[PDB]
Amino acid sequence: TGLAADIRWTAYGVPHIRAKDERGLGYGIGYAYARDNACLLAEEIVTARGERARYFGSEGKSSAELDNLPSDIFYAWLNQPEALQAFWQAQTPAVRQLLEGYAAGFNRFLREADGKTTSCLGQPWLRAIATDDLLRLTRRWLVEGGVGQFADALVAAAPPGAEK
Amino acid sequence: SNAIAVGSERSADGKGMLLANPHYPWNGAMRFYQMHLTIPGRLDVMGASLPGLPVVNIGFSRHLAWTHTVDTSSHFTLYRLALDPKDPRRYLVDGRSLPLEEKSVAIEVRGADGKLSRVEHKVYQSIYGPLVVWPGKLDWNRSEAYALRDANLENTRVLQQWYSINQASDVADLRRRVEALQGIPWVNTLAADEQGNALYMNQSVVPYLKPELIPACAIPQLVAEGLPALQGQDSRCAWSRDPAAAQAGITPAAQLPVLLRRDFVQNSNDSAWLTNPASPLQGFSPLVSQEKPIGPRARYALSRLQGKQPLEAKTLEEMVTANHVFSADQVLPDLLRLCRDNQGEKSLARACAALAQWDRGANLDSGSGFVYFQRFMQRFAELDGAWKEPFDAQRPLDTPQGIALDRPQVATQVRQALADAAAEVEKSGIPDGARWGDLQVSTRGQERIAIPGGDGHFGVYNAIQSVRKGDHLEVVGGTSYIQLVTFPEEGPKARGLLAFSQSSDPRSPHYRDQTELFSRQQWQTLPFSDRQIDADPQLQRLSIRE
Numbered sequence: 001t002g003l004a005a006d007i008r009w010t011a012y013g014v015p016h017i018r019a020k021d022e023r024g025l026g027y028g029i030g031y032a033y034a035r036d037n038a039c040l041l042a043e044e045i046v047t048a049r050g051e052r053a054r055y056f057g058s059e060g061k062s063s064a065e066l067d068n069l070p071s072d073i074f075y076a077w078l079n080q081p082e083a084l085q086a087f088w089q090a091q092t093p094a095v096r097q098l099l100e101g102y103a104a105g106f107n108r109f110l111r112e113a114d115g116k117t118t119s120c121l122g123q124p125w126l127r128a129i130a131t132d133d134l135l136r137l138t139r140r141w142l143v144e145g146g147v148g149q150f151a152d153a154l155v156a157a158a159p160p161g162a163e164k
Numbered sequence: 165s166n167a168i169a170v171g172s173e174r175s176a177d178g179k180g181m182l183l184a185n186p187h188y189p190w191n192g193a194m195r196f197y198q199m200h201l202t203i204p205g206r207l208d209v210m211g212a213s214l215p216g217l218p219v220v221n222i223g224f225s226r227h228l229a230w231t232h233t234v235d236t237s238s239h240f241t242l243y244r245l246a247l248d249p250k251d252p253r254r255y256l257v258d259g260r261s262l263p264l265e266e267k268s269v270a271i272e273v274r275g276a277d278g279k280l281s282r283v284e285h286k287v288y289q290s291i292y293g294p295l296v297v298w299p300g301k302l303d304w305n306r307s308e309a310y311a312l313r314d315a316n317l318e319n320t321r322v323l324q325q326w327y328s329i330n331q332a333s334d335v336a337d338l339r340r341r342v343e344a345l346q347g348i349p350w351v352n353t354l355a356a357d358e359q360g361n362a363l364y365m366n367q368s369v370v371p372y373l374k375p376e377l378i379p380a381c382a383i384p385q386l387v388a389e390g391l392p393a394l395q396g397q398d399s400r401c402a403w404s405r406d407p408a409a410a411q412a413g414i415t416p417a418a419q420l421p422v423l424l425r426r427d428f429v430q431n432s433n434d435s436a437w438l439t440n441p442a443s444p445l446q447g448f449s450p451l452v453s454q455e456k457p458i459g460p461r462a463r464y465a466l467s468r469l470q471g472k473q474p475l476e477a478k479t480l481e482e483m484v485t486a487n488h489v490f491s492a493d494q495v496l497p498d499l500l501r502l503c504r505d506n507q508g509e510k511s512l513a514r515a516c517a518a519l520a521q522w523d524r525g526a527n528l529d530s531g532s533g534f535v536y537f538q539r540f541m542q543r544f545a546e547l548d549g550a551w552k553e554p555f556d557a558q559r560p561l562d563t564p565q566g567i568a569l570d571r572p573q574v575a576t577q578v579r580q581a582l583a584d585a586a587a588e589v590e591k592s593g594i595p596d597g598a599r600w601g602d603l604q605v606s607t608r609g610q611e612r613i614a615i616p617g618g619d620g621h622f623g624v625y626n627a628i629q630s631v632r633k634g635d636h637l638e639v640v641g642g643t644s645y646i647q648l649v650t651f652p653e654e655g656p657k658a659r660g661l662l663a664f665s666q667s668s669d670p671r672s673p674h675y676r677d678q679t680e681l682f683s684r685q686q687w688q689t690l691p692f693s694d695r696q697i698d699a700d701p702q703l704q705r706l707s708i709r710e
Contacts, residue, residue: 004709010691010700013666013674016200016210025203029218031708033197036667036674041215044193053273054280063192069271073285076269077294090320095327098218108710117672137216140193142322145350146240146314153296154312157288159252160305 003027003104019101022094026101027108034109039120041106046125048136050076055125066151074151078143079136087135099131165233165433166461166625167352168469168480171426172360176474177650180335180356183480184222184231184647187620187627189640190606190664196221196645198662200692201330209330210692212645212662219326222645224656224692227334227358229649232351236435237370238451239350240314241403242302243292243396244383252306255290256397265289292396293317311396313403315369318411321347335361335424342367343417346410352431358651364429366421366436366445369414370452374404378450392451421445421453428469432461432620438560441466457555457564460623464490466561477650477659483625484646485685487526487616490623492537495544496524498552498567502578512579514596515540515586526618526626528601528683532589534618535603539585541622547581550574604630604637606664608676613683615639646687658690 005028006018013036017028033041046052047062050072062071088096107128115121140148147154166185175181188194193215200210201220211223222231248254248261255262267287272280288295290311296302302310316322325347332338334357342348342365353365371392373381381401386393395401403413410417421436423429429439436445436453445453458466467490468483469475496519503516515536522533544550552566568574594603601614620627620642628642646660663682666674681688691697 001710004707006707007705008697009702009704010697011688011702012198012662012678013672014198014200014690016202016691016697018202018204020203022203025201025207026218027708027710029199029201032199033215036672037195037197037215037669040192040195040668044215047193050269050271053271053283055274057274057276063189069273069283072271073269073287076271077267077287080269087320092324095323098323098327102216102218104710105708108708115671117667117669119669119671134216134218137193138323141214141217142316142319142349143314144194145234146316147294147312150296150312153298153302154287154294155285156299157295157297157304157309158286159288 003101007032022097023101026098027105030102030105031109034106035117038109038118042126044137045129045133047071048075048079048140070152070155073155079139084132084135099134102134103129103131167231167233167354168428168430168465169354169356169362170428170475171362173426174428174475176476178360179358179651180360182229182231182356182649185484186222186644187642188644195668196662198666207331211647219323220330221326224649224658228332228338228355230338230353230355232353233431234433235350235352235366235368237366237368238392239316239369240312241371242391242393243311243313244393245290245309245311246397247307247309258399315371315414316349319347319349319369321345322349334359335363339363346417354429354431360426362425362429364423364439366453367417372404372406372413372415421448430465430469432459432465434458434462441561458560460491461620461625463561464623464625477648481648487624487626489524489526489618492524494565495567498569502569511583511586515582526600526616526624528614528616530600532596532598534600536585536589539588540582543581543585547577550578606639606679609670613679615683616685617643655693658692659687660690661687
């Protein structure tokens with residue numbers, strides 16, 4: 001509990017979320033977003049977790065057009081457990097609550113989904129999300145102006161052998 | 165991305181006004197989503213946000229509207245390592261040999277047979293960060309390697325930053341909140357408020373080096389090619405620390421460009437420099453802002469914004485919806501006269517006719533002249549000294565301009581470029597009766613929707629990036645969330661669209677509804693007040709709890 005939201009949708013499916021605190025606010029956002037975009041978020045979380053090769057094999061690419069395996073190596077490196085924990089520890093109570101509510105709201109939609117607006121119902125990668133998954137997405141976006149632009153370059157960096 | 169903020173001295177109503185035209189992907193993890201957030205009494209904000217982020221990224225509130233554009237500041241530095249002559253897995257700092265750290269990650273891989281294999285991969289790290297390789301440019305040999313220090317890896321403030329922006333009252337409060345926290349990773353911020361203030365901030369997370377260190381610490385050849393590369397063998401080239409900065413090693417806020425005016429500010433992904441040409445922003449670190457020639461989108465905006473005439477909401481809207489290919493202004497007049505000089509040339513006839521008939525636009529109804537123009541410009545871009553008037557730092561708004569046709573070699577090369585462009589266009593096999601909207605589309609299920617706009621590099625303010633898929637050009641990015649905010653007496657008036665629609669799922673009622681509208685360029689009210697929301701005949705309500 002603390003998880004309560006009022007949602008109004010206007011034309012074009014634009015949600016207007018009202019709550020008494022950040023936890024309720026997140027609850028509404030995550031639920032509304034899942035109704036429209038559950039499959040997208042699920043896919044991008046697989047990417048940010050470094051599990052693309054696990055679900056899709058080495059031949060495919062992410063939506064950023066990176067090969068699955070190099071993408072996975074990069075995100076496994078970026079989103080190590082120690083890095084996620086330090087990031088979480090640095091978050092204010094308000095932000096922690098927004099994220100907590102968001103994860104609960106998304107998962108609530110997933111429990112109830114019957115395929116009406118969800119094309120990937122039944123896929124193993126469509127699953128309950130955690131606040132750590134939201135952190136993975138945040139950090140992915142955070143480094144888009146930096147090391148994320150060198151993902152392939154980082155994966156390619158190996159010391160020389162005995163060459164001339 | 166484009167952004168224009170208009171203040172009390174230039175707006176038709178004497179109040180603030182903001183056009184937000186971010187250019188982002190139409191799919192994936194940076195696909196915008198519209199939402200309005202309210203915690204009654206303390207938070208009331210509407211706009212668009214990114215997947216999985218429970219704050220508004222670009223939006224507006226009761227007295228304020230803000231947006232962002234990708235800046236030109238560096239947000240990382242590369243470090244050239246001097247390797248230990250005895251060991252390529254060791255590197256020298258102040259002549260002392262240090263070992264690289266080895267971090268292994270393990271990845272599961274699904275094989276053809278459907279079973280999982282474990283792959284282990286070593287990531288080498290220096291005191292600066294991970295090593296990176298670009299074969300043929302940033303190698304790892306026996307003499308040198310390159311490491312990358314990303315300033316945003318330590319930016320744990322990013323979510324708090326936008327949550328704080330969401331709570332901002334007016335332009336002054338927004339400035340305070342952003343300068344105090346310094347949590348913005350890699351974008352400019354532009355804003356306008358009801359009182360008629362217009363704000364530009366190049367306030368992001370930027371590596372800090374004191375002025376005295378730049379000459380000695382830069383790698384000259386690499387900096388000359390646009391890479392923030394430093395000498396990683398000298399401890400004096402570590403990012404400088406300043407207690408005023410929110411994060412150790414980043415540039416303090418007082419040293420980053422800010423412009424607060426009552427006329428206008430604009431940005432189209434160039435540096436802070438010509439945000440408003442009446443008050444140039446100069447004298448910053450090269451890691452922050454340089455005086456570099458502005459792109460044609462900014463040149464276009466400034467050509468419509470300069471002067472004394474009042475700016476209406478309609479004016480800013482039409483800057484997007486006109487789909488004017490501004491780069492044609494600099495080259496097409498001279499190109500057409502080359503065409504008239506060469507009417508006996510069989511290989512030029514179709515191109516010259518299409519170019520002469522073209523409306524200089526990227527509208528749905530624009531003719532094949534746009535396609536011919538694009539292919540010519542890709543070749544024109546490669547020629548040396550072909551501008552009649554080359555870039556003039558003294559005239560940064562009006563140069564480069566025209567083709568140097570009076571020079572014999574240029575005339576030959578420009579004619580050849582047009583001949584080759586025409587060949588490429590006619591080889592593609594598309595008919596000549598075909599209009600731009602017949603070519604550029606967004607697929608929705610088995611259907612296609614015609615999409616207006618064109619590449620930002622050709623000076624189309626409504627920037628749309630597309631790629632060949634099947635027989636069409638499939639839109640991948642560009643104009644995305646559109647928001648135009650004014651402040652009449654009753655509350656903020658916001659007008660716009662989400663070009664690709666709310667839902668990425670084909671099953672949703674909101675998969676293509678706004679895309680149909682974007683195609684017709686028919687922007688809509690973004691309802692913000694309870695009254696506006698209540699007036700909507702499509703209104704639906706659900707309350708949830710657990």
